[PDB]
Design a protein around this ligand. Sequence first.
Ligand code: CYC
Ligand code: CYC
Ligand code: CYC
Ligand code: CYC
Ligand code: CYC
Ligand code: CYC
Ligand code: CYC
Ligand code: CYC
Ligand code: CYC
Lengths: 58, 162, 162, 162, 162, 162, 50, 160, 160, 160, 160
Amino acid sequence: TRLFKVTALIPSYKKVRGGRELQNTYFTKLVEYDRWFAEQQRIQKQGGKILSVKMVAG
Amino acid sequence: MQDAITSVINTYDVQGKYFDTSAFDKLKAYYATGELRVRAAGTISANAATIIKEASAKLFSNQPDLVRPGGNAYTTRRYAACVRDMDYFLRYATYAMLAGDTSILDERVLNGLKETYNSLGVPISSTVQGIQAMKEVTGSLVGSGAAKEMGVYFDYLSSGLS
Amino acid sequence: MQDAITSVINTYDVQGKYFDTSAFDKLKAYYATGELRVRAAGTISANAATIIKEASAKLFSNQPDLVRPGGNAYTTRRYAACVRDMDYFLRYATYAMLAGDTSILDERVLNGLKETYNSLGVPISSTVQGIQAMKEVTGSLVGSGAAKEMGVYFDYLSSGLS
Amino acid sequence: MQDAITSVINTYDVQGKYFDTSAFDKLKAYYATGELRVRAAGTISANAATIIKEASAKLFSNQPDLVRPGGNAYTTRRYAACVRDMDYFLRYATYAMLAGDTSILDERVLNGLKETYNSLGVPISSTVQGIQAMKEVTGSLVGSGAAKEMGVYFDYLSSGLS
Amino acid sequence: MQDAITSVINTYDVQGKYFDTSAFDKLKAYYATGELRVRAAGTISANAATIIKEASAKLFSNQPDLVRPGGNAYTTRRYAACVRDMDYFLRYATYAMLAGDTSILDERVLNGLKETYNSLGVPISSTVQGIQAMKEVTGSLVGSGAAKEMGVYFDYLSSGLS
Amino acid sequence: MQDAITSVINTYDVQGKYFDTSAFDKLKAYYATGELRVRAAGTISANAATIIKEASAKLFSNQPDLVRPGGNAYTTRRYAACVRDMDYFLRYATYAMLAGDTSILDERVLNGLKETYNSLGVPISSTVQGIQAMKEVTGSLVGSGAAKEMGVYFDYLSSGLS
Amino acid sequence: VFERDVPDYQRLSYPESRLKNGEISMREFIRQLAESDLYRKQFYEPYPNT
Amino acid sequence: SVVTKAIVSADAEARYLSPGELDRIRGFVSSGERRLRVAQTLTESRERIIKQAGDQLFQKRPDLVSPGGNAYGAERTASCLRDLDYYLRLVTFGIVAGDVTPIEEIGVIGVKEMYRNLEVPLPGMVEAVKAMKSVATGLLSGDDSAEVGYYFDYLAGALA
Amino acid sequence: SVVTKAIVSADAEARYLSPGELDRIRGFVSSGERRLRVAQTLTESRERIIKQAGDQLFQKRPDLVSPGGNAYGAERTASCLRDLDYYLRLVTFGIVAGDVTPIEEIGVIGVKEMYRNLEVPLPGMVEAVKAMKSVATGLLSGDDSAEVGYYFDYLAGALA
Amino acid sequence: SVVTKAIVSADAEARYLSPGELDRIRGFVSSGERRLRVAQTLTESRERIIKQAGDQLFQKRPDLVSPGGNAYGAERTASCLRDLDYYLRLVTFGIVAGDVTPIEEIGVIGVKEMYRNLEVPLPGMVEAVKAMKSVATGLLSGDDSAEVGYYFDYLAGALA
Amino acid sequence: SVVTKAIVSADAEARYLSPGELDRIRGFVSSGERRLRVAQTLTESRERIIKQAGDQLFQKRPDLVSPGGNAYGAERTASCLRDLDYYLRLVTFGIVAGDVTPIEEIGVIGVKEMYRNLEVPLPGMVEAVKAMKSVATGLLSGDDSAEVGYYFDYLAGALA
Ligand SMILES: CCC1=C(C)/C(=C/C2=NC(=C\c3[nH]c(/C=C4\NC(=O)[C@H](C)[C@H]4CC)c(C)c3CCC(=O)O)/C(CCC(=O)O)=C2C)NC1=O
Ligand SMILES: CCC1=C(C)/C(=C/C2=NC(=C\c3[nH]c(/C=C4\NC(=O)[C@H](C)[C@H]4CC)c(C)c3CCC(=O)O)/C(CCC(=O)O)=C2C)NC1=O
Ligand SMILES: CCC1=C(C)/C(=C/C2=NC(=C\c3[nH]c(/C=C4\NC(=O)[C@H](C)[C@H]4CC)c(C)c3CCC(=O)O)/C(CCC(=O)O)=C2C)NC1=O
Ligand SMILES: CCC1=C(C)/C(=C/C2=NC(=C\c3[nH]c(/C=C4\NC(=O)[C@H](C)[C@H]4CC)c(C)c3CCC(=O)O)/C(CCC(=O)O)=C2C)NC1=O
Ligand SMILES: CCC1=C(C)/C(=C/C2=NC(=C\c3[nH]c(/C=C4\NC(=O)[C@H](C)[C@H]4CC)c(C)c3CCC(=O)O)/C(CCC(=O)O)=C2C)NC1=O
Ligand SMILES: CCC1=C(C)/C(=C/C2=NC(=C\c3[nH]c(/C=C4\NC(=O)[C@H](C)[C@H]4CC)c(C)c3CCC(=O)O)/C(CCC(=O)O)=C2C)NC1=O
Ligand SMILES: CCC1=C(C)/C(=C/C2=NC(=C\c3[nH]c(/C=C4\NC(=O)[C@H](C)[C@H]4CC)c(C)c3CCC(=O)O)/C(CCC(=O)O)=C2C)NC1=O
Ligand SMILES: CCC1=C(C)/C(=C/C2=NC(=C\c3[nH]c(/C=C4\NC(=O)[C@H](C)[C@H]4CC)c(C)c3CCC(=O)O)/C(CCC(=O)O)=C2C)NC1=O
Ligand SMILES: CCC1=C(C)/C(=C/C2=NC(=C\c3[nH]c(/C=C4\NC(=O)[C@H](C)[C@H]4CC)c(C)c3CCC(=O)O)/C(CCC(=O)O)=C2C)NC1=O
């Protein structure tokens, strides 16, 4: 179909990052439909939790 | 994710206490069931494609409108998405059975799937029927002792998706 | 981010006005405090580790449960993340004190911090108390003149978490 | 995106039917206006920079405070963003006119645009004024029939903003 | 890449000349061959799988040791890599035929290919034999007129590798 | 990569043969020493930091110019890189000893190492002396029976670098 | 991504607006730059796949 | 469609359509009536096409309708013919569109996985598409036959 | 050309050309004789077009030819006419190629940097191109006039 | 292999092997003699396994050796049994290695592409692998048959 | 644990567990009784282990309990012994898990930063862990002693 707007939180589990890394932890982004399966799988396998999924366009 | 062992470890670590006899008994229970869990995982893996075959065949026989013009599974693309979802459900349910814990279903399956399905308009009832079909088809292959355990995680997936 | 000088420049550019007596007095005030600000930034950067140690010790002495099992700072990983957050707060408070503005605290610290802590499970009140402990420890070192200025931005962070 | 042909195809594909007399009538109607649409698109492509110049000149003539200090289009950066947006509107109106369908306007322009302008502080009324300015300049350039078709997508952009 | 028209444009541009009678003759020749080239391209695309089927079949019939243990095309990975290479050769020879020029074969295929096969241990002579087999298969399907032109580019690849 | 088992398998695969008596003899030979290999690997894993400290101390004592100003290990950065490289050699030698095969040393350590060190300016002879110091330190800890097997791979590294 | 400065007439304005609006991240900006016709023209078309 | 491809390509580079793209759209819309009558004649005779194509397919590969085959029995044979009907409808869509995108989104993307989950052999589909090509090109003029045959060729190539 | 664009588009997606792209190439080669007629017509009237366009340019902008101008003198006015000759040649190249790629890559990419370096006023280039457009389209037939006008319009937009 | 996979996993993390990886290597080398006995048993009876599995495969799937099938004829049937012999040898390699890495490297990467290029039905390959699994586990005790069937099931899943 | 690591590795490839991973889990669960016996033994004797390990550490490093030492005083020595107890419990956790994972999440990730913030000398940590290793290994049987020493060795290497 078309774009999702997904909000996710990806915590850190393998180390403690000296950089600010807040923009890499909680973020909302637009994903194309054809990419969302892989992106959701990557978010899940990184231990991140998906706050919300919406369907912006389509 | 956490299995049964890591579940007990986390429960006793948050309290800050060493293992008790209760913890040891839970661990013994998991070690007792481990061999049958491995046999069930092997049987499911050996038959995974066949299980998806039969379960999707049943799901589309009970609801032919799903794969007909206007149905949520009407195209080669949407049909493929449906069967891929079924395959992922089966593999992750087998993971959760082998681990003895439903944590992987929460972390790597139900984590965001309800919202994705709601946004897309995927029929939740029909998805539950498909998962029930997989449960039925797998129970025949794995045997009653393994089927009772696989039903726990299939039911967990259906409940989370509902 | 935004400087005090950049602040005056924007407030006069949106008016389409050249600098007047008031703007020149504001710029003079910032230029006059600049040397004190640089001294305080140098002292803080020299003693950043010692401030974080003293403040974390004070925080975990007032709230010992935070580092005992069941506390949000019970693991080496969560304890490290805790002291790391405190280092974040000190370094960005020093940036903002040097800038004479709280813009950087909004843009690069507090933007989505409260919701991130809420999702992670971090006690916001205890993080605020750790920020307060940094306030007192830093004010001890920098001196009476720089302590009030630096505590302005510590209070800004504390209120933005509150 | 979808065009008129693609829209008819999708209608009949969801219906599951082959093309009917009405579908062929719609396709004939679209094919009949193809040369007109192509002529209008080529004329606009030749004249796009001109159209933007007169449209922005008229818009800023009627609302001169937009580009004076304190207005939304006051800076080189803001003025450039304004004229860039107007060029986007012209190009996507031309795309929609070629496609004979407004879907590209929703998918690629209007979705999110209203809250983007509302969060930034871009005035919607002045944007609609600029869109109508482009509409009348384009209509003077493209002749009567092409103007009648072009106004549909210009009005679509305007009403999709409000 | 250059096609035939691009090649004529180049040879006339590098000397600052407008097109002459000879240039227009070359352009007429290419436009005349265009329909045959398009027909051959469509036929080959429809039958690319079959061409690879038979070409590999006869290459491995003439050289059985390639697919037998110890050969470079012996494992499913190496066999798949070989048929993927033949796919490359067919698709790019079809591009070059459709262009009427061999520049795409120079830039995208032959550039560094002997280096690649030498580093891989791929037998180049047998690859040339596979290209010859592919020529033999394709010439049957495209017909004699298209067979001559397509064999031009198959022979270009064979000469570039050998 | 390869180990003893995988080496024997590839040897028989390239001939397209089933396992023979000599093959099963070699497989038994590897299985017999697997226990000793695991024991030694755990010994190095436990004592790797001590081994690197003592070997680096011995090397920098024998060649003090390596760490005096103007030496190739003279900076905290280059000294760190030197001890890090020694740790890499120890770790990969342990991998090779556990695999019962020197193939991993070729493919993952020794391939392109002389070129790398030559472009860096790192003295290869001193690196060999560091590897010998590591051999001497490791032999005492592991014990003579394991020390011979470990020294096989240490000397392989030294000879490949020499 | 393009190994040197890209002139203004070749820069992709739509990704840039998306990025400064916060709609996409730098990773998606880099993806848009990679998937443009300028990248295919400079770094795919004149080279073999290897 | 041709129009959608041109617009998408221009939009990707953030530009108006070039004279070449406008020429392409001109040539497409100038041939709209021919494509329309071709789709008309395929639609009005779809039953003949499907029947004759099924006959030819089962004659060339009887193993499909032989016992143990994927299309054994009147129910499975009916499903086979229904699939052929689907693909004829998609070919008509592709003819009117001027490109093969309706066929691609409706019946090519995911066809491999779908037919594996159905146990349908892809060579059987490819031969059925050739049978449809022959039957349909039978009842159209030479240029119209070539035009339909190109789309049937694409469908056969995508099925393989 | 058109063929090159179709091929690079197919290649970037690792596929053969679709029926729509082959149809585009078919339409391009079926119009080749007309394009060569138009390009040969523009080649015959090279000198007429350039001299008339220079006259129209230099009457509208006398200061360019007047002392202190950019084109003052026989040498610089000859360089001006030479640039016009460059762009008319490029237009013929684009006509035969069926698209504006030769024009964009020989005379459009970097033209602003070129003419900033040479201190040539770009509006002068634009309205010199409009002068060539008017003169050239006065010579062609109306159908050919529209086609040539597309390339001249593209070049004029490109200079601005 | 077990040791190979443990080393690769420890290498990707740039660390020495963990107590768990050392423990599983210990367990694998403890089981070496039993695995070697199983591999010898499968090797000594390879001709019987191949012949019997071919018979069961051709009984259950007679279409393969029927006219039009890929195994039709003497030489194609011989190459069929040769493929079965390949996969039996790879199963023995997997048993001795303790993992499916050799089977992956030699006969799983690209199998679908290869058998597509060979007109080999993959359901037939799966059925043949199941036939070998039954015949091979028939010649073994239960404890051995479990792991041997696990390797054969890996093959069947990879081909499916 | 072993099961969790196997599942994570298999899911990194979107595949079911290989025969090797299944054998690994089988060998793990077949060892659960021995692991639980070892964990029981270490838990029952925790106070002797901690007392004797702290005594050994302070005998070998009197500077930690001397004035100016990090563990000087009753409260700091109590915190030292409590840390030793933490790590003994983590060792038991890892023993039942079959891998050093729980040790890694609870007591290794960020450990150097935490002992940096607390002015705890990491060599003192390594030496205390070595003392705990010696005491605990003195209690268990040799076969279990080696396995427990492996976990203590992982801990000491992680602190160093
Ligand atoms: C619009 C795109 C689209 C297509 C193409 C499509 C195909 C399709 N064909 C199906 C059944 C089928 N399709 C076939 C066709 C095969 N039989 C022979 O082998 C031939 C080679 C071949 C046909 C030429 C058969 C035999 C079945 C029945 C399978 C079964 O019930 O076991 C099904 C399952 C639903 C049902 O039972 O009817 C689908 C989804 N679905 C779509 O949404
Ligand atoms: C590993 C955990 C996980 C899963 C399982 C998952 C499923 C998933 N299914 C999707 C779409 C879909 N899913 C289905 C399947 C449903 N619709 C049918 O009617 C059936 C009743 C039913 C299956 C039994 C369909 C048909 C679509 C296509 C929807 C559409 O294109 O509009 C999508 C949208 C993106 C894409 O398909 O590429 C996701 C992410 N995502 C995950 O991260
Ligand atoms: C530069 C601005 C910035 C801030 C402020 C920031 C906070 C922040 N803290 C985090 C985790 C954490 N933060 C803390 C600290 C809190 N919990 C303790 O109890 C204390 C009360 C308190 C500190 C005084 C802890 C314990 C975690 C670990 C949470 C977990 O993963 O379980 C994380 C998640 C990523 C990670 O684990 O490293 C972020 C993004 N990030 C930023 O980029
Ligand atoms: C602070 C940043 C900023 C700048 C600089 C800016 C310039 C600016 N100059 C404008 C008009 C103008 N600007 C000029 C100046 C030019 N005439 C000659 O050629 C000279 C070379 C040159 C001046 C030295 C002229 C003549 C106009 C009138 C154009 C017209 O009437 O159409 C306009 C159009 C609207 C208006 O007149 O208010 C803007 C926005 N706007 C900004 O927000
Ligand atoms: C588009 C232009 C292009 C080409 C052609 C190309 C060839 C190419 N062939 C390769 C491997 C290979 N190629 C072959 C094919 C040979 N083996 C047999 O002997 C045959 C005689 C012969 C084929 C007819 C084989 C067996 C390999 C695997 C080599 C190995 O893994 O050791 C590889 C390495 C990557 C891989 O394994 O897939 C490349 C890059 N690369 C390019 O960018
Ligand atoms: C400019 C960059 C640079 C530095 C700084 C550097 C330091 C350095 N100090 C060393 C030894 C040493 N360094 C020290 C210093 C320590 N003694 C006490 O603990 C103090 C806390 C502390 C000093 C204030 C000592 C005692 C040794 C002797 C180590 C031994 O004999 O085992 C060594 C080992 C080789 C040698 O002794 O020549 C180096 C490389 N090397 C460099 O390339
Ligand atoms: C092709 C689809 C598309 C659209 C439609 C689009 C509009 C758009 N305009 C924007 C900003 C803007 N847009 C305007 C234009 C306004 N200024 C007012 O005076 C005028 C009445 C009005 C225009 C007629 C201005 C001034 C900004 C800058 C606001 C800022 O920098 O804070 C932004 C935010 C980021 C940026 O600076 O680019 C977007 C997304 N962007 C897109 O990618
Ligand atoms: C070591 C890994 C490896 C494998 C497995 C392998 C298989 C393989 N089988 C082949 C032929 C073949 N393979 C088969 C087997 C099929 N017959 C029926 O359809 C069955 C379903 C199925 C077997 C159960 C047949 C019939 C052929 C002959 C194909 C032909 O001549 O057209 C070929 C082509 C070259 C040749 O004839 O030898 C290969 C490469 N090659 C390898 O390097
Ligand atoms: C389970 C994961 C975990 C660990 C391991 C952990 C260690 C830990 N030990 C602490 C105190 C301490 N720990 C020590 C231990 C040192 N004394 C000597 O130097 C020895 C080298 C060494 C012990 C063998 C000492 C002396 C203190 C008191 C330091 C102080 O409060 O000033 C503290 C500060 C809070 C408190 O007093 O309880 C932590 C967080 N915390 C955790 O959540």
